[PDB]
Every structure is written in C-alpha cells, then in structure tokens.
Amino acid sequence: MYDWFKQMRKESPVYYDGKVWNLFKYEDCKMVLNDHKRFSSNLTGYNDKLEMLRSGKVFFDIPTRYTMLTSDPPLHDELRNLTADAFNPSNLPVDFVREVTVKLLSELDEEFDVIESFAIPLPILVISKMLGINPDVKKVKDWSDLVALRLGRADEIFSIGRKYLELISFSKKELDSRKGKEIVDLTGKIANSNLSELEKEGYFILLMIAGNETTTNLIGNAIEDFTLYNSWDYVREKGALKAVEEALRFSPPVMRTIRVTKEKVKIRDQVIDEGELVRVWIASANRDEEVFKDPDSFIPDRTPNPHLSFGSGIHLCLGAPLARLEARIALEEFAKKFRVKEIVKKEKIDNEVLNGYRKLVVRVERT
Ligand code: HEM
Ligand SMILES: [Cl-]
C-alpha cells in the first residue's frame, strides 16, 4: 500500500478513482480535515434528521448512523462536549490501566499471542471501566469486530444481523439503567441528555467500540515495529512517549478517513464539485517526504512527529489522550517485564481501513 502512496504522492496527489476522490499529501490532507466548513462529516443524514429525531419521532435504523463521528457543527460541539472532558488526561483512570495491564502480564508464558492475550483485553477492560459497565470481554470484542470489520465495505456497514441486535439491545438495556441519574458512568451522562432515543444508542456504541479495536491495533503494531527495528531498549530507559508516537505514524490503526463536500472546492489543479466523497489517507500523509525526514524509516525518538494518525481538527480522536496513555503503559510494562526473542507468526486484520493484527505470536523470556 505504501509504494502506491509514494507513487501517488508524486504522480497524482488529488486522484479520482471510480467515484471517490483521494488525497495522499499531508498538506492537502491536514487542510481538508480542518476544513469542516466545506469538507463535511455529515455522511449519515445525522444532521438532516436532527429535527425529526429530536421531535420524538422514532424509526428503525442502525444506531451507528448517529454518532458525533458523522456529525457537523454545531451538533458536533453538542455531542462531543457532553463527554469530552472525561477523556482529558486529568480524568483518565491511569491507575486502573496500570493495574489491569500489569495483571494482564502477570503470568505470560514463553510463547503467547500478544493480541488475544493482552492487546484485546486492556482496551475493552478500560473503556468499559470509564463506560461504567463490565460485560464479557469476548462479547464486547465480538461486537467490535462486527462493527469494525465491516468498515470501508460500501453497505455492509449499515446492515443489521442477529448478533448486531444483541449489540443494540445491550446498549438500550445499559442506557435505561443510568437514567434515574447520579451519573458516574460515561454511559450515565448519555442516557440523561436531550439526545433522541437512537442518538443515545449511537453515542453508546461509538465509545465502547471506537475505543478498543483501533487501540488494540496500535499496541500490536507497536510491539512488532519495536521488535523489527529494535526499539525495546530505548523504551526501557527513555520511556514510550515518542516511540508510541512513531508507531502511530509508521503503522497507523486507521489507514484513512472520508468526508463530503458542501461546495465546489479546488485542491491543487483538481476541482471537486459539491456532494463528493474525499478519502483522506492518513497513512500516506504520515509518510509524506515533504514533512517527515527519512519518512520510511522507523525512529522511536522521531520528533517532531505531527502525524495524522488520530486525525486533526475538531474531530481529532476524542480518545486520543486515553489511547496514548494505554499505549504507553502497556509497552513500558511489557518492555520492562519481557525481552522479545522473535516474531514467530502473524495474521492481519482482514480490513482495508483498519491496519492491525488479529493474531501476533512472539517468543519471549522474562527479564
Ligand atoms: C488507539 C488508536 C486510535 C486511533 C488511531 C484513532 C484514530 C482516530 C481517528 C483517525 C479519527 C478520525 C475521525 C475523523 O476525523 O474522521 C478518530 C475519531 C474518533 N476516535 Fe479514535 N482513535 C484511537 C483510539 C480511540 C479511542 C480509544 C477512543 C475512545 C476510547 C476513541 C474515540 C474516538 C471518537 C469519539 C472519535 C470521533 C471524534 C469526533 O468526531 O469528535 N479513539 N479516531
Ligand atoms: Cl446474521
């Protein structure tokens, strides 16, 4: 995928495939992501039916159509601000994370799968913690793949199956709980808000899932990258702050984004009429020669590192501060306790916009 980008970065930054536009240039990308006035995120008719929905009307539709993720201002501000200050560094359960993470490694054997044994649990253990719920890790993971693994796939991203209704009823049940208030759970806040009934169900599923899957991929990626390019030592003594950041740029969980135009736009020599999709490639951007010196090299201490892994602008991953945190503690405790001796085998997540491993086996020996 990267050779293509490098090529597209040179030959054609603003490319039009069959029906969607594509940007591979950092500059073009960043600008577009910060231009919510023209490049909108209203891709599910969320804003459109905000009046109809708030009027109390109720129609059947997958709750995932209505998340702040696909909403434009000012509705966005309204949805994001409700639980935005909960994900600020100061309000992060840094303790919980460290304790659940340390336990997570308490008995790791000589050859285990870091994904299904560490990468998957932590995210879900934590987001649910903040979420104020606590179900089956396998259950949540199932619901996550169900939602994520259908990303990018043109229509199977709005379709409802049986196991999906299980996700819907789950949210409805959990939600119904928290009302009566005395808020404590992030879920708590959600239920008791002016939001329409299904908006609540969308916001709920949005934090539970958008949390873990991408967060797990980041740690799986980091572990490989840190091994392939030998960065473990550096981690043990200097920390994981800058490294965690290199992982993001070099091996991003979210390979790209998409947006629609509200007016005619002209990015470079290419004009784009309104009502068109614009695939914003974060991965390509992260490797742009114009912005990163020796971009195709992995540098744990690489700085500056203005990657677009978490996005940019007003939709900048709301869980960004939490992920870096979870990322840092998992890798340092892992780096502290273990010493990777080799990457035995690995299976990639079958998805084109989610860069990650579903299984990553490693041989190790305790310090
Ligand atoms: C761990 C690696 C993670 C990555 C790489 C990542 C990446 C991204 C990206 C690229 C976007 C772009 C949204 C848009 O501009 O199109 C986004 C949005 C969002 N992310 Fe993440 N994310 C991660 C973890 C998390 C976590 C852990 C949570 C919550 C626990 C979370 C919550 C959100 C939310 C709510 C949004 C939507 C923000 C809004 O629209 O204002 N993310 N994320
Ligand atoms: Cl089904």
Alpha-carbon distance of 351 to 152, in angstroms, equals: 8
Alpha-carbon distance of 4 to 12, in angstroms, equals: 11
Q: Are strands 39-40 and 265-267 parallel, antiparallel or unpaired?
A: unpaired
- The alpha carbon of residue 43 and the mean position of all alpha carbons in its chain are separated, in whole angstroms, by 18
What values do phi and psi take at 144, rounded to 5?
A: -65, -55
Residues 6+ apart with CB under 8 A from 77: none
| Amino acid in position 163 | K
What values do phi and psi take at 225, rounded to 5?
A: -50, -50
Residues with CB under 5 A from ligand 2 (ion): 161-162
Q: Between 197-228 and 121-131, two packed helices, what is the crossing angle to 10 degrees?
A: 150
Cis bond leading into 74, ω under 30°? yes
Residues 6+ apart with CB under 8 A from 165: none
On the CB side of 331, CA atoms within 13 Å amount to 37
Alpha-carbon distance of 190 to 202, in angstroms, equals: 10
Alpha-carbon distance of 274 to 2, in angstroms, equals: 29
Atom nearest to 216 CA in ligand 1:
1
**8 A C-beta contact, residue 47 and residue 72:** yes
Residues, the chain, total?
367
Alpha-carbon distance of 145 to 141, in angstroms, equals: 6
Alpha-carbon distance of 288 to 24, in angstroms, equals: 8
Alpha-carbon distance of 343 to 361, in angstroms, equals: 6
The CATH number given to whatever domain includes residue 282 is: 1.10.630.10
Alpha carbon of 146 to ligand 2 centroid (Å): 10
Question: CA 132, 133, 137, 141 torsion: positive or negative?
Answer: negative
Alpha carbon of 137 to ligand 2 centroid (Å): 21
Q: Is 49 exposed, middle or buried (0-12, 13-18, 19+ CB in 10 A)?
A: middle
Neighbours of 197 (CB within 10 A): 14
Place of tokens 């404590």: 184
Nearest protein Cα to ligand 1, atom 1? 215
Alpha-carbon distance of 211 to 178, in angstroms, equals: 20
Task: Provide the domain count of the chain.
Answer: 1
**Encoding tokens for residue 257?**
């984004």
Widest Cα–Cα separation across the chain = 61
Beta sheet of 338-348, edge-to-edge order: 111-113, 357-366, 338-348
Strand partners, 111: 363
Range of the domain at 325: 1-367
Pick from 150, 214, 116: nearest CA to 351: 150
**Encoding tokens for residue 289?**
């020669």
Nearest protein Cα to ligand 1, atom 19? 317
Which residues have C-beta atoms less than 6 Å from ligand 1?
A: 33, 68-69, 80, 127, 206-207, 210-211, 214-215, 218, 253-254, 257, 309-311, 315, 317-319, 322-323
55: left (phi over 0), alpha (psi -120 to 50) or beta: alpha
Alpha carbon of 364 to ligand 1 centroid (Å): 32
Atom nearest to 69 CA in ligand 1:
40
Alpha carbon of 163 to ligand 2 centroid (Å): 6
Nearest protein Cα to ligand 1, atom 36? 317
Cis bond leading into 121, ω under 30°? no
Ligand with the closest atom to the CA of 34: 1
317 annotated ligand binder:
yes
3-state secondary structure (DSSP) of residue 48 = coil
Nearest protein Cα to ligand 1, atom 2? 215
Please spell the DSSP secondary structure of 254-322, one letter per residue.
B--EEEEESS-EEETTEEE-SS-EEEE-HHHHTT-TTTSSSTTS--TT--S----TT--STTS-TTHHH
Place of tokens 């995120």: 41
Name the E strands within the chain. 14-16, 21-23, 39-40, 111-113, 257-261, 265-267, 270-272, 277-280, 338-348, 357-366
Alpha carbon of 206 to ligand 2 centroid (Å): 21
Alpha-carbon distance of 187 to 192, in angstroms, equals: 9
Alpha carbon of 316 to ligand 2 centroid (Å): 33
Alpha-carbon distance of 11 to 7, in angstroms, equals: 6
Q: In the PDB record, what is the listed experimental method?
A: X-ray
CA distances from 117 to 120, 129, 256, 348 (A): 7, 19, 27, 16
Q: Is 83 exposed, middle or buried (0-12, 13-18, 19+ CB in 10 A)?
A: buried
Strand partners, 279: 22, 258
What values do phi and psi take at 52, rounded to 5?
A: -55, -50
Residues 6+ apart with CB under 8 A from 231: 225, 243, 246, 298, 300
Nearest protein Cα to ligand 1, atom 16? 257
From 317, 318, 324, 325, the mutation candidate for ligand 1 (largest count of ligand atoms within 8 A of CB) is: 317
Enclosing H/E stretch for 238: helix 232-238
Ligand with the closest atom to the CA of 166: 2
315 annotated ligand binder:
yes
Distance between first and last Cα of the chain:
36
Nearest protein Cα to ligand 1, atom 17? 317
76 annotated ligand binder:
yes
Residues 6+ apart with CB under 8 A from 21: 14, 15, 270, 272, 276, 277, 278, 279
